[PDB]
């Protein structure tokens, strides 16, 4: 765990830093001016109060300021006061403390949201951010539950209403979302979510799914005291802490030592223990953990020739090739009966062979099933044909024939019993497997098999202001300022919120006997939403039937387990769309094409309308 | 055996010497083979001798009867002596004096010396007995394509390079190199056997020309091949025919006036070397990178 | 020590060869990816359909090894600029093949040769390739220092190597590069692998490559002399060269076979390693500046912007400069207050622009070193530094020092000053607006007072550096003029560049300026004689300042204050590079302009050719008052 | 790639001289192909590939009767908006003598092979509308001894100074693309205020039918223009000549200009940075015609007296759609 300690009292900065260092913390949150040291800027005489106005920067090294000290805005500063004088004064003071934290070069600075209106706070912070394009991060201290909705019901003439308030119970998030919006989604602005004694309904907690939470603040109050005197937490608090650890947020301790028998390392050690006593970090999971919410442009194996290490990661996925082998094996047993095993050889073509893991799989299946096969390995990437022919000469012999051409081109010598493909993207057909196989179909026997025989894409609406900002940052010179929103990205989604169950989008079947072949599509999907949230995009997955009951899937429900060949795809939208509980999201999708390009367009039509994204493939085309 | 056959030279008694390279695959090496049955080549099992080199072979030539001079990719000139029984092949020496691939070699009239040309732009004169370099000549400005020793003079030889220069040499002179419209690059050189006054050269454009050093004038030339001319070999015939080899994969046999007499498409890959049979003077053996060894009957 | 690689055109087993060169001590290997003699046909049957494999597999190494250890090499039979059309098209296809394969392997660099004047089609194909995938792959151009033609042995009877004087022709190889480099539109993925021969040419031929992106120096085994023991060594001139190349931190490549066969290839490498260790050890300035070599930074504006803490920290971490300031104050004290009056006349000494107060401590040490009375003021408009100042003052200085938190142009001081000490100089002297600040702070100076520094002067010199020109070119940002980066200066420790003429003074300012018609605007014209062929890319800028009489500071290379690393040089670029032939004169024009709010520079080259006027109306760069 | 609007065709047709020349060429070819005695027994299959609104069709008809020979006519067009006009004409006037074929000539599987094919696919730079590729695709259905009108064409280039037009190009910078894209693309323009710096020279030539088994429409040309004045190079003007049939030709080249013909204007290939040229120096420019499965485009560069950058590399700024 990465951790920090929150204090509103620091008598000697050196001694205090040493203490919290020995306690085991990674950093310290502290005020930079004294928290009770209110200052005047407009009116004499206290205007001319003689300095020093705070303690010197020489008291630490630049390394220490840069890595160990989170600044804190003094609590007397109220930029949204109803009083004009306090407004202007708090403006000057906020500028003062922020500019000073920047002078010290602090890695982060804390500011509180503890009411609905922080409009002028946002105005000042936005102004400041646009004064030197610095690194300095800004953490917004937002409580899960507003202090009003957390107070003890001990006021005679002001009773805490014991009724059901769905929207109201989320109000703090609203605060953030409004502030966050006024600052125009500044990447230098993040959340420091504060956690209290009473945890609210789990939808109130889920509101923060997809939000840029960098820090979770735990007070000493919420720590239950067990039989020994230890500090511990409730079972629900622990569920929460696990959720927060998946997002890898830093944890901050605030409050004084109520369990004064011990030392503050007790609180920290409870956490450390919890973090070690979770399912140990897998190989799969540690591989994907580096790609968490990392955006990448979709590969185009048809138009682009893939690099070597790309194939290398494709091959390093056993489960998938085990499935392909089993599918080939069952198809062999179905096609060639037992008595004919030696008299009937099967022509089995790997269309899109790469470096030939499918070839070795076809061979292992041939011997596992004990049948005769003649093999072709087709590949339009000559840099991989190199590897293929080296293998072939060395190992496979003349059993395999390496064919270096496009399957839409190749005039094959003899028709095929089976054709095996791998032309699927994260959205199934987004690598144009339908067109390639349609071209490669004519040289298939009138009763032959395509592995895979079917595939289907899946979509689901998602909230994630985090990923929305990541996309927003993809704006490039020399193109439309919003092109990044009109193109998909391959990404291991992590910090996001699924808003409705995935539903099938486009399906393709091979062989496609249809005399009127048209791979274009117009689909409409209605996603019921049972929460308040903000639509930022659509996650995309796929399913494919290789043969009968052997299938592959990255869809979270039907996910082929342990398979890391694909990540999910993401279709963003330019403007985020608010969705209230009970509403339905209506998305529209088109698969469009001409002789040269294939591309997708999409639009949201409910609860509100978006614009049509990537029209005429102007921002994203897939090359035929 | 490695797939790419680079050289094929007939010995006086009718034995065939072959030099092969491997230009693809994991191992890029070469090998030498001796077939006392010429029709048994290329099959390795039916051979009289064979040896594996560290590196491939670019050009190759006999040294009398027991000597084999090899220009290796290593930058080395290797001399391989033949065994007392003519069953084994042994490395007499192997010197790394060129800085880059030795691309061409030829033995002089005296048979105790040789001349080598490398991609390092240098030509070198070798005493085969002492096993040292006598002269090192940086005369060209590009990689040396071909060097052809004069048949009847020890101190004289021809060289041609990608600097578009054909140099006639004379180690006796203080400035041994002598240059002789600048057409397309020269690629192959062949002295005329009986007249040490004249020779022929092919270019990269597939044109073969005839030169008289005395008249220093291009008397004749002919567009034989559609592609680069990689080799030129005269016959031992009383009035000698001329063989021309190209990258268009054909062999062409020409008269004294450079007209096409014979032409063979049998090869499906580059044609590398070609030697006439000193036994049957009308027979001509060619080799190439399609691993074929063809015997041609010439009218 | 040295980063190194080994060049080979023969690799029988890639694994064994890599292991050998690894045990020899090399960091990487340059090798061909297809066999160098394995010419291939693409258009015409039958060899068109030659059966593969066309080269060795990628499985023979790990992705690690391909990415870090293997520099690819273009097969030498490929001639994209041949006079023969067939060879042209075939070499085009083959160059595409080998390059795309090197990219498939993910090689960190690929070698291609320039060994003739015309490589137009080579550049066309390489440019086409680069614009297919925004990849990292670097491209090293093998260019000889001396063309093989001008290096051949003079042994041709009817073609004598003329032993005449040909200034321009001796540089021809650079020309090759510069033309190729230009056709590819200054691609940052294209660099130089300069090859070095036996005979080294005139020093100007060598200097032509100053400022060029040399990544690799190629040393053949031929040029190594054999010393008394039998080891390989180089001439003294070759060694001067190697030192120059080591300062550019280029990689060194060995080519050729082992002629000193007594030893092993670690002998050449060890000669190199020895040379690198036996290099003048890094003085304090060089180690600090080495991280900032050719690193661009926007000029600080201490007037408009409040400086951060560590910025001041690096300002203070420079003893020499404050020693000089202390000595200047000390001499001025002795001059102003005579010996007998030392106890009866106290001097009002104001540090205008005090920062965190190193000048304050310097004033104190000078006061006691000289033994005179002083009352001190520390003026500062940056309150974040006023914090540090007042903490110091309360704790240490006491009421002797008065901390004044205001702009010196604003402050209505209580009593007039005997001395004013400033630090408002940039790399170009006045580029932080020291003249205007001191002009505003002047009125509260006694009618016979002193300003330390009393004078300063900027200096300019034309420089060639395609490297830094490309660095500037890459500074284009969205939402502004595409060429704004060329109309603004950058602070940078210049390193890989070529000074084309001696620095000359540009603008001078004197303080106090009694002149009733104060005008800090300037129009200067500088004529720089150039005795070499080169390409103008920008102008380096330095400064000199007189603190007091014979105590001065300078970053100017000739008069550099030694051991002082407070400033780096400034760079004024130009949009289009300008060819300059030997003997020509570069005429540049500079303006210091201003209004009520801004100050800025404009500049233009008027000879040998005209440029555009740069930063007109300060549209791309203004200095905030 | 684009279907032309109506008034575009209208200005194409409003040029008599050119269609008079086409008619005369067809007429001479008819007399050469069908001898006098066979005039009634041998009918000629004559296909207008790229017919538009059919001025070439009416020209073929007038030529057939002027020469007195039998012809069966096909009018091929991939623009259906013009096929409308064509079929209206055909029903009303031409009858079943003409067959209107609405398809790409690279696609159409014609019923019977052709005696003559007539095209109009030339731009100001000749091949810049991809007439070579279109006719190469439409060639297979030509008789093994048939004729293409035009049978040949050739592009021409000349260096020009014109700071005026250089500034006009400079002002073509658009948002959301490379700031210098305007310099890497040609423009059709009636050049007026400019300075020709050297005599035009031929750049690329194409011959139809192209029997060559190794068809390659790519080109790498190098042109050396001697300049006998001081000036500043800003671009290259481009023109074309075409042989319709033997001694009937068309040209917009200023020296050999077909008089009274205003169907084409010159093309202009600009360069990013202007280049000073002193009297006596020679301008060496390089041009490439490049292509792939989908696009065709030109690249170009000046190599003397100084080097420019290579313009429109990979067609990044200008491609011609196949
Ligand atoms: C078999 C198959 C597999 C897949 N799978 C994926 O696509 C995929 O989910 N992932 C994500 C994760 C597992 C890593 C590989 C790959 C990926 C995605 C996007 C980019 S973008 C890029 C860059 C390309 C340019 N070079 C220079 C740097 C890398 N690599 C990649 C790799 C799709 N289709 C087929 N048929
Ligand atoms: C006393 C004095 C000294 C100087 N000297 C310089 O200016 C200078 O030559 N050098 C280069 C070298 C020595 C290092 C400090 C400084 C520098 C320059 C440019 C930037 S730009 C930047 C960034 C600012 C924003 N933060 C977030 C990152 C750093 N720092 C810097 C530092 C000028 N004037 C006065 N009076
Ligand atoms: C037969 C033939 C003729 C030509 N000729 C030309 O091309 C040409 O020289 N000229 C210039 C002059 C004579 C006028 C027509 C035409 C032209 C050029 C460029 C544009 S751009 C545009 C716009 C298109 C979009 N709409 C909305 C506005 C007009 N029209 C035009 C017209 C080329 N090829 C063939 N085969
Ligand atoms: C293993 S990822 C898909 C593989 O199939 C190849 N491929 C994709 N489309 C085709 C096609 N139409 N013809 C041949 N190989 C193809 C790609 O180049 C890649 O190696
Ligand atoms: C030590 S770098 C220059 C210093 O002088 C300060 N400075 C610059 N101009 C003024 C001014 N007009 N008044 C006060 N301090 C100034 C800057 O804030 C910085 O601390
Ligand atoms: C009269 S300008 C050229 C004419 O030929 C047509 N055209 C160009 N290319 C083709 C083609 N491949 N098939 C049919 N018509 C074509 C254009 O649409 C236009 O009408």
Numbering used by the authors:
A (entry chain C): 14 to 637
B (entry chain B): 27 to 206, 210 to 328
C (entry chain A): 13 to 637
D (entry chain A): 316 to 637
Please share excerpts from the published article on this structure:
Shifting focus to the area of the binding pocket around the benzothiazole, we hypothesized that electrostatic interactions with polar side chains could lead to increased potency. Glu320 sits toward the edge of the pocket and is solvent exposed in a position that suggested it could be reached with an appropriate substitution off the 2-position of the benzothiazole ring. To test our hypothesis, we extended basic amines into the region via both alkyl chains and rings. Utilizing an N-methylpiperidine ring gave the best potency in the series, again with good stability (HAP1 MTAP-null GI50 = 7 nM, human Clint,mic = 10 μL min–1 mg–1). A crystal structure of 51 shows that the N-methylpiperidine engages Glu320 in a salt bridge with a distance between the acid of Glu320 and the N of the piperidine of 3.9 Å, consistent with the distances observed between ion-paired amino acid side chains in proteins. For example, addition of piperidine to the benzothiazole in TNG908 to give 51 increased potency by 14-fold in MTAP-null cells and by 30-fold in MTAP WT cells (MTAP-null GI50 = 100 nM and 7 nM and MTAP WT GI50 = 1600 nM and 53 nM, respectively for TNG908 and 51), decreasing selectivity by only 2-fold. Bicyclic compounds all achieved good potency (HAP1 MTAP-null GI50 = 5, 2, and 4 nM, respectively) but they had poor selectivity (9, 6, and 8-fold selectivity vs MTAP WT, respectively), unlike the matched molecular pairs in the unsubstituted benzothiazole series where they had excellent selectivity (46-, 35-, and 39-fold selectivity vs MTAP WT, respectively). This trend was observed throughout the series, i.e., when Glu320 is engaged in a salt bridge, bicyclic compounds generally had poor selectivity.
PRMT5 plays an important role in the regulation of diverse cellular processes via dimethylation of target proteins involved in splicing regulation, cell cycle progression, apoptosis, the DNA-damage response, and other functions. Due to its involvement in these critical functions, PRMT5 is considered an essential gene. It has been shown that PRMT5 inhibition by small molecules can selectively kill cancer cells with homozygous deletion of the MTAP gene if the inhibitors leverage the consequence of MTAP deletion, namely, accumulation of the substrate of the MTAP protein, methylthioadenosine (MTA).4−6 MTA is a weak, endogenous inhibitor of PRMT5 that binds competitively with S-adenosylmethionine (SAM). Compounds that bind PRMT5 cooperatively with MTA, and not with SAM, can selectively inhibit PRMT5 in MTAP-deleted (MTAP-null) cells and kill those cells while sparing normal (MTAP WT) cells, since normal cells have functioning MTAP and therefore low levels of MTA. Targeting MTAP-null cancer cells via selective inhibition of the PRMT5·MTA complex can improve tolerability relative to nonselective PRMT5 inhibitors8−11 by limiting inhibition of PRMT5 in normal cells.
